[PDB]
């Protein structure tokens, strides 16, 4: 009940080697992360493009540490204007996107990035927590309709992925405790609906439970309280979700469970284009 991800596919069915590393990680505070040594380890797992999430930094604060990504040298960030130390995502890639857009067109939270590349679209997303208490349930239900629609027109031109912390446990599969939570921010019969109307709608597929349909007690976060993380007491909240068009070039998709920096840890997506 503790999970060792398994190892690396770098081939994809048709026996194609990948050509594109994509990694997502919460880092849950972007200076406390960095101070915790996270671009280490980014320099070790050494992704053509990395998502990062819940950055809780404005671009004024940005430490320039992450200019020392020189295989990353091309960022993308996006923070809410009103709201300081809340929400804010990033996007740092090898090669700079054709175009890179904010937000999904109501308007800001920084919430998401949609960069479009040579062969797909990358949105990366920062979805909002219900909240404790699911005090902003009712924000998440309006924001994950907007999404969807947002994301149909979008997926129109060339495929996608989606990536980011979703949070939402889409099945019982995807948490430890499934029975004592199907009331709490992330397993509600609303959030987990809106997982599978999303996956509907685009249509995407999750890259992971396709490749593992079976495997259990495979999560990407665990609260800080208790030793949850040590007792992998979590939940599957970070995906990478791809349209049907991209699944043949799908190498594997990985949970980097032992990356330590935040009470999540990154996941990482091989793709033979």
Same mark, same amino acid.
């Given at each position: ?35 915790? *040594? ?44 009103? *709201?300081?130390?809340?929400?804010? =995502? ?21 919430? =998401? ?35 969807? *629609? ?10 996608? =992925? ?112």
């Amino acid at each position: 009940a503790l999970y060792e991800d398994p190892p690396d596919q770098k081939t994809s069915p048709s026996g194609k080697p990948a050509t594109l590393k994509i990694c997502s990680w919460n880092v849950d505070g972007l200076r406390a992360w960095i101070k915790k *040594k996270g671009l280490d380890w980014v320099k070790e797992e050494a992704p053509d493009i990395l998502c990062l999430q819940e950055t809780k930094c404005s671009e004024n604060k940005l430490p320039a540490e992450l200019q020392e990504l020189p295989g990353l040298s091309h960022q993308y960030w996006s923070a809410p204007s009103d *709201k300081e130390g809340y929400s804010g =995502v990033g996007l740092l890639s090898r090669q700079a996107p054709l175009k890179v857009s904010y937000g999904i067109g109501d308007e800001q939270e920084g919430r =998401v990035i949609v960069a479009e590349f040579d062969s797909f679209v990358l949105v990366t997303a920062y979805v909002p927590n219900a909240g404790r208490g699911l005090v902003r349930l009712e924000y998440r239900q309006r924001w994950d309709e907007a999404f969807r *629609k947002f994301l149909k027109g979008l997926a129109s031109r060339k495929p996608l =992925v989606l990536c980011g912390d979703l949070n939402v446990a889409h099945e019982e599969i995807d948490l430890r405790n499934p029975k004592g939570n199907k009331k709490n921010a992330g397993f509600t019969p609303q959030e987990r609906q809106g997982f599978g109307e999303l996956l509907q709608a685009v249509p995407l597929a999750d890259s992971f439970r396709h490749l593992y349909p079976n495997t259990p007690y495979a999560y990407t976060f665990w609260t800080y309280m208790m030793n949850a993380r040590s007792k992998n007491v979590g939940w599957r909240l970070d995906y990478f979700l791809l349209s049907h068009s991209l699944l043949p070039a799908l190498c594997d998709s990985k949970i980097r469970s032992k990356a330590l920096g935040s009470d999540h840890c990154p996941i990482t997506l091989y793709l033979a284009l």
